[PDB]
Amino acid sequence: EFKYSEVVEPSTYYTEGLCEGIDVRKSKFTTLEDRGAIRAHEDWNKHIGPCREYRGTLGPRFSFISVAVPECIPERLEVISYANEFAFLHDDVTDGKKRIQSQLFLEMLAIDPECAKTTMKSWARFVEVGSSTRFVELAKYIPYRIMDVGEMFWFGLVTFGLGLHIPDHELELCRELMANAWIAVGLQNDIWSWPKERDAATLHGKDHVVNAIWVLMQEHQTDVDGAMQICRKLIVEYVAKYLEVIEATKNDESISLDLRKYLDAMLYSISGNVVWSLECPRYNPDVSFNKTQLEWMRQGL
Numbered sequence: 001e002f003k004y005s006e007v008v009e010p011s012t013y014y015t016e017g018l019c020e021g022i023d024v025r026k027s028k029f030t031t032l033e034d035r036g037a038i039r040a041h042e043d044w045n046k047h048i049g050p051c052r053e054y055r056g057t058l059g060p061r062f063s064f065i066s067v068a069v070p071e072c073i074p075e076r077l078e079v080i081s082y083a084n085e086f087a088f089l090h091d092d093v094t095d096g097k098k099r100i101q102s103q104l105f106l107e108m109l110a111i112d113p114e115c116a117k118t119t120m121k122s123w124a125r126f127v128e129v130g131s132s133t134r135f136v137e138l139a140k141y142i143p144y145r146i147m148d149v150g151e152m153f154w155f156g157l158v159t160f161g162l163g164l165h166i167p168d169h170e171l172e173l174c175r176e177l178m179a180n181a182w183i184a185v186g187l188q189n190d191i192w193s194w195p196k197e198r199d200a201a202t203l204h205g206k207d208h209v210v211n212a213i214w215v216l217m218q219e220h221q222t223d224v225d226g227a228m229q230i231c232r233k234l235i236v237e238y239v240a241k242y243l244e245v246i247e248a249t250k251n252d253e254s255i256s257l258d259l260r261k262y263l264d265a266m267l268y269s270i271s272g273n274v275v276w277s278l279e280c281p282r283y284n285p286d287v288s289f290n291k292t293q294l295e296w297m298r299q300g301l
């Protein structure tokens with residue numbers, strides 16, 4: 001079942017109890033994410049503007065894709081990391097000679113035509129219905145944040161990296177079974193991106209912060225630490241909830257073999273998001289990169 005990654009020893013990483021019952025798996029080719037990610041920096045620095053040693057998907061020990069999508073097809077590992085950085089590089093713009101990224105798309109047709117064609121169209125619904133605020137109730141924030149984190153982007157990204165062909169009729173079915181998983185990673189990110197996003201709202205003149213922490217502070221009339229405790233409590237529960245879905249969806253043949261794989265692959269995106277966000281320079285400024293990672297950022301590839 002797993003032939004592209006290994007299980008990381010539980011006594012070597014911190015979980016904070018936010019992914020109980022899930023193994024932490026790391027891609028056996030993590031150096032491919034580096035080159036793919038760093039080349040996105042260089043292409044950024046060469047075509048749109050300054051970009052050197054950017055803190056995004058990369059980590060010194062756990063890079064996002066290498067640990068969130070550990071069973072990614074090795075030959076596709078570089079190009080997925082290339083796209084993931086541009087995703088990270090664009091979310092910061094959210095918070096033009098850039099149309100010359102058709103080289104990314106055309107590269108994916110050289111690998112898999114049908115998988116890419118759906119993914120590119122999966123990103124159509126993402127980009128086009130993304131541009132179209134301020135939440136004080138959590139029940140209303142969950143539907144929004146589910147989109148704002150990038151579910152459609154991730155769907156097209158993983159399915160290509162795993163080579164999954166889900167029939168067009170299960171597309172509405174799939175999104176209604178990873179609700180608990182997507183709520184989990186959404187609250188997780190809102191906790192660890194909170195400092196950089198709270199600092200962000202301080203400059204724009206924002207009286208609000210589009211973050212679960214701020215939302216909970218308004219809805220429950222509590223402070224920062226009070227919201228953190230509530231948020232962490234919900235994550236554990238929603239993580240548990242999704243784990244029940246897995247055992248229930250283990251044996252249905254009307255379910256695609258691919259979709260059944262994709263549901264299982266969502267587990268390690270949860271455990272991966274935990275170990276990554278706890279170390280990544282994106283949320284942890286004081287953390288430095290690898291010798292190898294730097295040597296390619298400074299000296300190039």
Ligand SMILES: NCCC(O)(P(=O)(O)O)P(=O)(O)O
Nearest residue numbers: 088091095148149150189193
């Ligand atoms: N996975 C999306 C997370 C973010 O992009 P977002 O701002 O939560 O969309 P981050 O700023 O935390 O990197």
Ligand SMILES: [Cl-]
Nearest residue numbers: 014015016017
């Ligand atoms: Cl821990």
Ligand SMILES: [Mg+2]
Nearest residue numbers: 091092095193
């Ligand atoms: Mg952001």
Ligand SMILES: [Mg+2]
Nearest residue numbers: 091092094095
């Ligand atoms: Mg954002």
Ligand SMILES: [Mg+2]
Nearest residue numbers: 189190193197
């Ligand atoms: Mg965030």
